């Protein structure tokens, strides 16, 4: 069938029975760095099964008055296993990902989510003079959430989370130019996105640069009749692909 997948990475497997296809990147698959394009001279480390496996994040509840969530994900996996321990001991690192967002409901529920992965998402601040602080931009493996209203300008260091501007001062309907999928509860059950390494340099520091951002935005809100299950969660599992690290030092 065209509605089943099975993804195996490391000692973990993901099975699905209602799905669309998988979206691969900008058409390219994650690979390793070649000798033509490298700049750092020491030998990289490639653990490739201790780090390239499916890590599951915290679940969030899709309520009826929900606006959206976001993760950054070099940062979401900064405490996850031996991926987060290789980030601490090394100065450089590069990796691609595969993201599996999963949300099920019955035949009597309705709703629609946009699952988009954007690169280099500078968020905006509520006060027009400052930039937001780190804890407002990302939590480790916990979602930061959009709002259906506007954050006031009396908040000094806070992200402007008006959802229709997507946090970036842009049209939220135009976010379908990045690699994206939809979770329509009528037809779909999960969304899968395979992202390569996208940057302007061949390697980068994984602690002061988040070069991705996963946004999940309800374009059509959740609705059901009285009697059906009111609790609908959303779960995100992310697996690194072709990860390597240079510049071994102390632990930071």
């Amino acid at each position, epitope marked *: 069938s065209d509605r089943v997948r099975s993804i195996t990475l490391g000692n973990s497997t993901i099975t699905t029975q209602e799905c669309a296809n998988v979206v691969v990147g900008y058409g390219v698959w994650p690979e390793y760095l070649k000798d033509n394009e490298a700049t750092a001279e020491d030998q990289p480390t490639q653990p490739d099964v201790a780090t390239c496996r499916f890590y599951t994040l915290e*679940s*969030v*509840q899709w309520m009826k008055n929900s606006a959206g969530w976001w993760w950054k994900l070099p940062d979401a996996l900064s405490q996850m296993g031996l991926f987060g321990q290789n980030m601490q001991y090394h100065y450089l690192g590069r990796t691609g990902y595969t993201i599996h967002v999963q949300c099920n409901a019955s035949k009597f529920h309705q709703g629609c989510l946009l699952v988009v992965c954007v690169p280099e998402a500078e968020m905006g601040c509520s006060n027009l003079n400052n930039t937001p602080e780190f*804890s407002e931009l990302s939590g480790g493996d916990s979602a930061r*959430m959009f709002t259906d209203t506007q954050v*006031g300008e*009396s*908040n000094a260091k806070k992200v402007q989370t008006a959802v229709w501007n997507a946090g970036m001062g842009v049209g939220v309907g135009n976010l379908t130019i990045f690699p994206h999928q939809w979770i329509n509860l009528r037809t779909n059950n999960s969304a899968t996105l395979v992202m390569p390494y996208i940057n302007s340099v061949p390697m980068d520091n994984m602690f002061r640069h988040n070069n991705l951002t996963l946004m999940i935005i309800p374009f059509v809100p959740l609705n059901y009749s009285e009697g059906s299950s*009111p*609790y609908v969660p959303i779960t995100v599992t992310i697996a690194p692909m072709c990860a390597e690290y240079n510049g071994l030092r102390l632990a930071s």
Partner: antibody, heavy 123, light 106 residues
Framework: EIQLQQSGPELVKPGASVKVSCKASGYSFTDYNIYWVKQSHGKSLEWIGYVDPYNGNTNYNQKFKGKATLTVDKSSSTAFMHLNSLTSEVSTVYYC????????????????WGQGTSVTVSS | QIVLSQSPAILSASPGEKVTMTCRASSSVSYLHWYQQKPGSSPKPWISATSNLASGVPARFSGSGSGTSYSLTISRVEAEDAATYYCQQWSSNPLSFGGGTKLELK
């Protein structure tokens, strides 16, 4: 509007039982859990437990595992709480709150509270 | 279980100055909220998920903190925010309250 209307104050004897209620209106009743906390006359707030009105599932604090029993009534949108074996430490006030999901939906906290019901043991 | 230790227990301040009101946890916490209870009524839902001011809260109040340490701040202390402020966590551990930092004017 969203409003959680609680019961009135009432006096009990030492060793007796009491049943406090928390009627909620203005919203769909089975979409959110109902949390029960307590507050002494000079002390801080303490958590007792909650109940999910969709299936009647309750989860208690360990200190109140045998002396509190939470039930629900979907027909009239009322959540009850039965207290058992009351001592001199039950000269307190009991609140009911509203939050949805245990910590999947903890972004809002418990955002609508009750009035408070003061009980005591005396003669 | 995660306990929440607030400090100081009593905070005295002149009207028109900047105060800070911190809280510490035993481990990491998913969501942390703040409440205000004036004596004689139910606690009101104030600042939630460590930054978001509730509807009706003045702009003098802000919250911050991440990881283990969390804090609540008033820029100019007005005469009517004399109450006690509790702090609640919503983590994988069951539930906890802080201990009630009390504020009285000087």
């Amino acid at each position: 509007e969203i409003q959680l209307q609680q019961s009135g104050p009432e006096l009990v004897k030492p060793g007796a039982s009491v049943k406090v209620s928390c009627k909620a209106s203005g919203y769909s009743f089975t979409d959110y859990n109902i949390y029960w906390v307590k507050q002494s006359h000079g002390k801080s707030l303490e958590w007792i437990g909650y109940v999910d009105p969709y299936n009647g599932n309750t989860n208690y604090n360990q200190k109140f595992k045998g002396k509190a029993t939470l039930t629900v009534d979907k027909s009239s949108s009322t959540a009850f709480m039965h207290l058992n074996s009351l001592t001199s430490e039950v000269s307190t006030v009991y609140y009911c709150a509203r939050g949805g999901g245990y910590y999947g939906g903890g972004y809002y906290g418990m955002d609508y509270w009750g009035q408070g019901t003061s009980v005591t043991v005396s003669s | 279980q995660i306990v929440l230790s607030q400090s100081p227990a009593i905070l005295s301040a002149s009207p028109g100055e900047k105060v800070t009101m911190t809280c510490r946890a035993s481990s990491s916490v998913s969501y942390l909220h703040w409440y205000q209870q004036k004596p004689g009524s139910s606690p009101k839902p104030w600042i939630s998920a460590t930054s978001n001011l509730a509807s009706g809260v003045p702009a003098r109040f802000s919250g911050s903190g991440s990881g283990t340490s969390y804090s609540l701040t008033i820029s100019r202390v007005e005469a009517e925010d004399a109450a006690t402020y509790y702090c609640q966590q919503w983590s994988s551990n069951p539930l906890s309250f802080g201990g009630g930092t009390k504020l009285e004017l000087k």
